[PDB]
């Protein structure tokens, strides 16, 4: 007996006791755009498919798929998914959707990535999307978590990109990674909303206050984070709007609920 739409696991890398990433074989049928998400899952006691929405953390051009996942004890899926091993499989619906796609935007000089927690996942994909560096001139990556260890997955991803011999210094003065913690001490602190309103992120990167003038950003955090951020965006003059139609910015829930 086989598992419908089952992909094999090629690697697992634990980052903290609540965060882990892993890569799987790509369904020979999958065709997507960096930033979209799909459904993945495992089987429970009776053999029931527990499905959950997951951003594809790897760029569209990758032959393998990568996922960055939260680990919730009691979580039906993650309490299970966190134990996945190389060779083991998972279910993966090859139906890619999501509003976090570059097409949903259109302008040019800036493409901001504003995320918190695992909401970095889609940007781990987009930050490695060639289109982001062609249809746009500068990519800002704002990631805010509670502690430094939660920044690790995205910080090592960013370090590798820049330190890479060729692709590095190619994302030279294109990508600007602005990580922040809100609990642990870290050279750059403060929440994304606050640092945008107060303008710190501007006099920090030595740039021009995010104006609705052909700018652009994608938001991915909790619901409270999305509304807060959206408000702050318009506070400058940006307007929502998704998949296939000119707009100022897009958002997506990094998860449903209040978060752990």
Ligand X SMILES: NC(=O)c1ccc[n+]([C@@H]2O[C@H](COP(=O)([O-])OP(=O)(O)OC[C@H]3O[C@@H](n4cnc5c(N)ncnc54)[C@H](OP(=O)(O)O)[C@@H]3O)[C@@H](O)[C@H]2O)c1
Ligand Y SMILES: CCCCCCCS[C@@H]1O[C@H](CO)[C@@H](O)[C@H](O)[C@H]1O
Binding site for ligand FAD (CB under 6 A): 37, 52-55, 68-70, 72, 75-79, 117-118, 121, 252-260
**The only residue of 86, 160, 167, 205 in contact with ligand Y, by rule CB under 6 A:** 167
Q: Is 180 annotated as a binding residue?
A: no
**260: which 2 tokens?**
């752990």
Burial of 66 (0-12, 13-18, 19+ CB in 10 A): buried
Distances (CA, A) of 168 to 22, 29, 160, 189: 23, 31, 8, 26
52 a known binding residue?
Answer: yes
Contacts of ligand Y in 72-131 (CB under 6 A): 130
Query: How far is the CA of 4 from the CAs of 14, 22, 42, 91, 185, in angstroms?
Result: 27, 20, 11, 7, 46
- Is 182 known as a binding-site position? yes
Our finding on whether 160 is near ligand Y (CB under 6 A) is no
145 vs 171 by CB, closer to ligand X: 145
257 binds, among ligand FAD, ligand X, ligand Y, none (CB under 5 to 8 A by kind): ligand FAD
In whole angstroms, how close is the CB of 19 to ligand FAD at the nearest point?
8
Tokens of residue 75, six digits: 């979580």
CA torsion 213-189-228-137 (nearest 10°) is: 20
160/260 with CB nearer ligand X: 260
The smaller minimum CB distance to ligand FAD, of residues 162 and 182, is found at 182
End-to-end alpha-carbon separation of the chain, Å? 37
Cα 82 to Cα 2: distance, rounded to the nearest angstrom: 22
Is residue 254 at the binding interface for ligand X, with CB under 6 A as the rule? no
Q: Which of 65, 91, 87, 98 is nearest to 77 (CA)?
A: 91
Task: Say which residues have a Cβ less than 8 Å from residue 155's Cβ, sequence separation at least 6.
Answer: 177, 179
In whole angstroms, give the CA distance from residue 31 to residue 41. Answer: 19
Q: Does 141 interact with ligand X (rule: CB under 6 A)? A: no
> By CB under 6 A, is residue 224 in contact with ligand X?
yes
Question: Residue written as tokens 């890479």?
Answer: 164
**Would the annotation count 54 as a binding residue?**
yes
Q: What is the C-alpha separation between 111 and 132, in angstroms, rounded?
A: 8
Stretches 48-56, 80-88, 185-193, 245-253: which one binds ligand X (CB under 6 A)?
Answer: 185-193
CB of 254: closest distance to ligand X in angstroms? 10
Tell me whether residue 20 or residue 112 sits nearer to ligand FAD (CB atom): 20
**Residues comprising the binding site?**
52-55, 68-70, 76-78, 116, 118, 146, 182-183, 191, 228, 254-260
Q: List contacts with ligand Y (CB under 6 A).
A: 61, 130, 167
**Residues comprising the binding site for NADP(+)?**
116, 146, 182-183, 191, 228
Q: List contacts with ligand X (CB under 6 A).
A: 116, 144-146, 182-183, 191-193, 224-225, 228, 258-259
């Amino acid at each position: 007996k086989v598992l419908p739409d089952a992909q094999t696991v090629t690697s697992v890398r634990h980052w903290t006791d609540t965060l882990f990433s892993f890569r799987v074989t790509r369904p020979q049928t999958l065709r997507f755009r960096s930033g979209e998400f799909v459904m993945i899952g495992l089987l429970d006691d009776n053999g029931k498919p527990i499905m959950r929405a997951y951003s594809i953390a790897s760029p569209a051009w990758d032959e393998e798929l990568e996922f960055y996942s939260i680990k919730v004890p009691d979580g039906p899926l993650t309490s299970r998914l966190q134990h996945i091993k190389v060779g083991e499989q998972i279910i993966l619906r090859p139906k890619p959707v999501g509003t976090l796609v570059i097409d949903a935007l259109l302008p040019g000089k800036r493409l901001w990535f504003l995320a918190t927690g695992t909401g970095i996942a889609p940007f781990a994909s987009l930050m490695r999307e060639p289109e982001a560096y062609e249809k746009f001139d500068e990519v800002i990556m704002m990631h805010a978590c509670r502690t430094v260890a939660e920044l690790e997955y995205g910080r090592q991803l960013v370090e590798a990109l820049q330190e890479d011999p060729l692709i590095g210094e190619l994302v030279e003065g294109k990508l600007k990674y602005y990580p922040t913690t809100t609990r642990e001490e870290f050279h750059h602190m403060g929440r994304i909303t606050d640092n945008l309103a107060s303008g710190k992120v501007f006099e920090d990167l030595g740039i021009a206050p995010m104006n609705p003038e052909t700018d652009r950003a994608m938001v991915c955090g909790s619901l409270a984070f999305n509304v807060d951020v959206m408000k702050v965006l318009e506070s400058y003059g940006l307007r929502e709007g998704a998949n296939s139609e000119p707009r100022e910015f897009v958002v997506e829930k990094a998860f449903v609920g209040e978060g752990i």
